[PDB]
Amino acid sequence: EVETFAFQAEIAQLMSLIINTFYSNKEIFLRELISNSSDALDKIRYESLTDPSKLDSGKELHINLIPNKQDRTLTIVDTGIGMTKADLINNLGTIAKSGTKAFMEALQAGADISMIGQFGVGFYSAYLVAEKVTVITKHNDDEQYAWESSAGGSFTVRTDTGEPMGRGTKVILHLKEDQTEYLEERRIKEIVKKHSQFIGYPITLFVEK
Amino acid sequence: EVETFAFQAEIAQLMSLIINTFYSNKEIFLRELISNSSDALDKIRYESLTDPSKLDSGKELHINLIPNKQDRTLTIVDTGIGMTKADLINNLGTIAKSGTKAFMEALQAGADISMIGQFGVGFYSAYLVAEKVTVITKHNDDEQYAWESSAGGSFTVRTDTGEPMGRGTKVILHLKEDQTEYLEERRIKEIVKKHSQFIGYPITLFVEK
Numbered sequence: 249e250v251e252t253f254a255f256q257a258e259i260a261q262l263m264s265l266i267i268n269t270f271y272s273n274k275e276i277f278l279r280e281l282i283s284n285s286s287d288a289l290d291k292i293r294y295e296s297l298t299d300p301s302k303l304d305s306g307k308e309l310h311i312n313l314i315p316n317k318q319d320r321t322l323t324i325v326d327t328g329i330g331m332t333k334a335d336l337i338n339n340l341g342t343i344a345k346s347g348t349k350a351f352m353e354a355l356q357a358g359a360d361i362s363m364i365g366q367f368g369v370g371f372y373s374a375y376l377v378a379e380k381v382t383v384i385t386k387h388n389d390d391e392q393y394a395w396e397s398s399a400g401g402s403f404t405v406r407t408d409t410g411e412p413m414g415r416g417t418k419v420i421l422h423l424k425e426d427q428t429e430y431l432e433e434r435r436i437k438e439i440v441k442k443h444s445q446f447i448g449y450p451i452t453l454f455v456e457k
Numbered sequence: 458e459v460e461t462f463a464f465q466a467e468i469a470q471l472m473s474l475i476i477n478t479f480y481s482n483k484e485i486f487l488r489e490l491i492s493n494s495s496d497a498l499d500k501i502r503y504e505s506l507t508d509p510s511k512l513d514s515g516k517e518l519h520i521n522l523i524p525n526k527q528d529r530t531l532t533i534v535d536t537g538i539g540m541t542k543a544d545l546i547n548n549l550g551t552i553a554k555s556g557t558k559a560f561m562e563a564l565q566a567g568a569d570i571s572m573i574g575q576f577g578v579g580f581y582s583a584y585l586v587a588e589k590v591t592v593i594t595k596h597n598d599d600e601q602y603a604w605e606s607s608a609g610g611s612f613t614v615r616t617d618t619g620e621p622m623g624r625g626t627k628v629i630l631h632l633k634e635d636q637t638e639y640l641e642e643r644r645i646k647e648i649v650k651k652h653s654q655f656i657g658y659p660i661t662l663f664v665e666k
């Protein structure tokens with residue numbers, strides 16, 4: 249049922265540096281995840297321009313942000329193109345080996361962690377705030393899969409048994425104990441307004457009981 | 458031999474606003490074109506991770522900048538994934554109808570033209586400096602095509618008879634008469650250093666006799 253994989257050495261090194269480096273401006277993780285949702289939304293939009301049946305798995309193109317203080321999770325849902333199993337295994341659709349190398353060289357030429365998305369590896373900034381990340385994804389070709397990792401060098405992939413998602417990607421951030429500010433409505437609103445004001449899909453921040 | 462197409466009304470409106478709006482910071486066109494080359498380079502890199510034969514049409518992943526003062530052209534060449542004929546017709550692989558709408562709304566909510574790439578339509582910033590743009594492209598699936606437009610509502614596509622390119626995209630900017638600074642070596646170097654310092658492929662600026 250569950251397959252466990254080793255990250256490539258460079259990606260393990262990227263994740264160790266994100267986890268261990270002192271860096272206070274952690275809120276940029278949300279901009280990076282919302283940007284990857286926007287890129288995935290743009291891909292299904294573009295494919296649907298020539299094949300409208302690609303939206304038979306959901307016509308609405310949007311992003312939901314769902315805090316849960318009881319579970320200590322922040323979930324980012326989109327209805328973008330989704331990832332195949334192969335793309336999930338292959339670093340969640342990114343060019344992460346080469347992007348890591350360039351990001352390292354840049355951190356040497358003075359860059360800072362907030363520039364991670366210039367290297368094609370912004371997903372991994374989730375580990376600024378999450379002890380465990382779970383990525384549930386469904387592409388029109390393919391079945392629904394769950395990826396997960398608490399870092400430490402490995403990740404798992406399984407066929408997902410949760411709720412069907414139609415099409416798209418859900419990123420569940422299991423927050424570190426000192427990072428619960430990212431469940432607060434005022435804090436999430438301030439970060440989306442500062443860094444994702446011009447994203448071209450609706451972003452709905454859910455509220456809690 | 459030559460097919461002529463109308464731009465969609467929103468894209469014609471995007472190009473008219475880029476051509477007619479007073480806006481002095483025209484040099485951002487180069488960052489936008491070099492970013493689209495980087496995205497195309499990332500796509501063939503990612504595809505080659507699971508199918509190395511995709512690089513049988515050229516192993517090196519790079520960007521060349523070629524000024525020609527005699528022809529008044531600046532050419533941007535990359536060896537990225539290339540575009541099919543369909544993608545060229547469909548706004549050079551972009552979601553340009555919806556990106557235009559969001560860029561317009563943003564220019565209302567105070568944004569400026571330099572933010573065009575946040576709307577997925579940075580290509581069209583070429584018309585800040587070019588009277589005519591020619592896009593020659595070759596994808597592994599497909600033949601080599603040339604797209605061209607001097608704005609005014611239409612573009613052409615033909616099978617290209619120039620030099621074979623192996624794989625990738627060449628953007629030829631036929632500069633406006635008052636925009637020849639963008640052929641000067643010191644000027645191009647200053648713009649790549651200011652805005653494309655962290656692009657993860659080599660950028661070679663060619664020199665002239």
Ligand SMILES: CCOc1ccc(-c2snnc2-c2cc(Cl)c(O)cc2O)cc1
Binds near residue numbers: 283287289417
């Ligand atoms: C350089 C960006 O590369 C990217 C960007 C997005 C993707 C894709 S395709 N399907 N889902 C995602 C996705 C992935 C993540 Cl991690 C996410 O947070 C949200 C998503 O919708 C693949 C590569």
Ligand SMILES: CCOc1ccc(-c2snnc2-c2cc(Cl)c(O)cc2O)cc1
Binds near residue numbers: 577
């Ligand atoms: C939002 C970016 O969307 C993009 C970005 C790049 C592409 C692609 S696929 N093949 N070539 C290009 C390309 C296109 C242009 Cl115009 C260029 O200047 C250089 C290129 O290599 C398609 C959509």
Ligand SMILES: [Mg+2]
């Ligand atoms: Mg981008």
